[PDB]
């Protein structure tokens, strides 16, 4: 079946495209403790409908572009900027590193 997963939109800049951030939980293969990692997929939004802060389902799909190999299946909710917070601040901190 076409793989599918949900995630928060966190980039509306591109034309007819959006960025979805998706988390997944799994136990450390030697230290048990369940851990979370994340990834950003380039979703195809032909109707320019979905906006920032959206939680959505995306689907493994025909290659739209170099990085776009998914399409926005359907919305899940709008108010979710709280997550966009943590993601942006994460990118905020990188400043305070490189010298």
């Amino acid at each position: 079946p076409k793989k599918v997963l949900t995630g928060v939109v966190v980039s509306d800049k591109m034309q007819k495209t959006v960025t979805v951030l998706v988390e997944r939980q799994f136990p450390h293969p030697l230290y048990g403790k369940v851990i979370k990692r994340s990834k950003k997929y380039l979703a195809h939004d032909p109707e320019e409908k979905y906006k920032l802060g959206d939680v959505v389902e995306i689907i493994e799909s025909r290659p739209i572009s170099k990085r776009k190999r998914f399409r926005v299946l359907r919305l899940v909710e709008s108010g979710r900027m709280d997550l966009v917070e943590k993601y942006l601040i994460r990118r905020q901190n990188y400043q305070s590193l490189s010298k």
């Binding site: 450390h28 230290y31 048990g32 403790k33 851990i35």
Partner: protein, 122 residues
């Protein structure tokens, strides 16, 4: 260290270094004598040890102990290098292999002949 710490930093591997840069991990290495000579040992002992410096195929240059009584190594004796530190002498990392090349065996020896390239006497 908390499990989280282990999930982050993780336990470091060990990693060890080779007491013998005979290189290529080769079990042996042919070389050619250049300076055969006698040397005094370290602290608790005293005796004139017979060593020989040897230029390897590895472009190197190393001292090597010559085991057993008496030998026949000159300034150009090619000879097979074995590897095995001598604790008595500083800087000796390798034994020379008796019985191979210009490395003549030990004359007269009867016991442990194998370790000194001695043929079975009639």
């Amino acid at each position: 260290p908390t499990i989280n710490q282990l999930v982050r930093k993780g336990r470091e591997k060990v990693r060890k270094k080779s007491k013998v840069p005979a290189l290529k991990g080769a079990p042996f290495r042919r070389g050619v004598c250049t300076v055969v000579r006698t040397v005094t040992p370290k602290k608790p002992n005293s005796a004139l040890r017979k060593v020989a410096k040897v230029r390897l195929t590895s472009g190197y240059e190393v001292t090597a102990y010559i085991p057993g009584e008496g030998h026949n190594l000159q300034e150009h004796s090619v000879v097979l290098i074995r590897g095995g530190r001598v604790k008595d002498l500083p800087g000796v990392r390798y034994h020379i292999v008796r019985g191979v090349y210009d490395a003549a065996g030990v004359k007269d020896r009867k016991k442990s002949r194998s370790k000194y390239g001695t043929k079975k006497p009639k």
